[PDB]
């Protein structure tokens, strides 16, 4: 029955005024991309930065099991677009937000559905 | 300095043709540092400029390309160069990386441990190595050709690089190997490329373009490294991050280069010419299988 909840631990750590995880790999890009959340290549638009997926996944970064039966990681090997306003904490952003399964934009950060 | 707008500077041919003696490397711009775009890591920029330069060579780019990246881990626990390589390579490229220490990677598969423990069944279209041991930079002893991972690399290139494949191996004033320079003579073309963001360093990437599997040119590695040091000593390179700001043409153009299985008897001069122009890769196309030897005790 026992399982470690790293997501809530990091959220509480942030609330406690903690230093956000650093050294997420920001990519060079045109910044004229589709703005979608998770892509096969950097897709940041004028308002986004693109990071290497693995470097912004809490589970990859902390060396813990991914929270699902497959252990599958949806960021590793891809590129994640982060609003420039939140690019200081990409791990926290990806953790706290959700991707629209129809248009592929961040819900509340580019999704107009 | 119109080189400032290029991704870097390649060793001019005339410097390759000299017969210099090894000297200490004393860079005029030593300590200078290019101003990187906000929040961009040095290694992201370095790999980006390396890839921008490779875009100008006749790299074979087959479907289902195979790229292996040694020395991919950083002291941060992530793999910036691997992220840049995945961005640069065509979608669907099989990318394997490795490093002595554990790290988080965007590669299709990652092997941790000494380069010497890595084995692969298949051959590769592109080999990148950023492996570096900072204990080599000792200015109180002779600067002699180094072994260690370099040995491995050489072997790897000769055993597991497809004909027509290419390599970029990082070297410095003290991190170098004579046999690697000698191997450069087994490619259709070769150079030493210095990225503009890291021009203040003796670092360079030994680039071998279009592997031929045999020497087309006899290169003395000691003399060639002395030539490289002479070039760097007499040609100050202006630190520059300009090329980082235009990524519109960054992706490696998918060329669909043909891949043929051939026995060595079949590599005639027509085949060698096709190899030398980046128009042919010679290797099998079975599944990619890799492993890392584990010593038990
Ligand atoms: N014999 C070896 N086998 C495998 N890796 C090695 C060996 N010697 C040194 N290295 C690695 O070379 C790396 C040098 C790093 N500066 C590479 C930086 C990294 N490529 C980056 O993108 O930031 C270290 O991570 C070491 O683990
Ligand atoms: Zn992950
Ligand atoms: Zn939507």
Numbering used by the authors:
A (entry chain B): 18 to 130
B (entry chain A): 1 to 297
Could you pull the original sentences from the published paper?
Here we report on the crystal structure of SARS-CoV-2 nsp10-nsp16 in complex with sinefungin, a pan- MTase inhibitor originally isolated from Streptomyces griseoleus. Eventually we obtained crystals that diffracted to 2.4 Å resolution. The structure was solved by molecular replacement and revealed a mixed alpha-beta fold with sinefungin bound in a central canyon. Sinefungin is bound in the SAM binding pocket that is localized in a canyon within nsp16. The nucleoside forms hydrogen bonds with several residues including Asp99, Asn101, and Asp114 while the amino acid part is recognized by Asn43, Asp130, and Lys170. These six residues are absolutely conserved among SARS-CoV-2, SARS and MERS highlighting the importance of RNA methylation for coronaviruses. A key feature of the nsp10 fold are two zinc binding sites. The nsp10-nsp16 dimer interface is 1983 Å2 large and it is formed by the nsp10 helices α2, α3, α4 and a coiled-coil region connecting helix α1 and the sheet β1 (residues Asn40 to Thr49) and the inner side of the nsp16 J-motif including sheets β4 and helices α3, α4, and α10. According to the model, the first nucleoside, 7N-methylated guanosine is bound in the upper part of the RNA binding canyon while the second nucleoside is positioned in the central part of the canyon in a way that its ribose ring gets in close proximity to the amino group of sinefungin, which in this case represents the methyl group to be transferred structurally explaining how nsp16 performs 2′-O methylation. Our analysis revealed overall fold similarity between SARS and SARS-CoV-2 nsp10-nsp16 complexes (RMSD = 0.747) and also a high conservation of the SAM binding site among coronaviruses, in fact, all the residues that are involved in ligand-hydrogen bonding are absolutely conserved between SARS, SARS-CoV-2, and MERS.
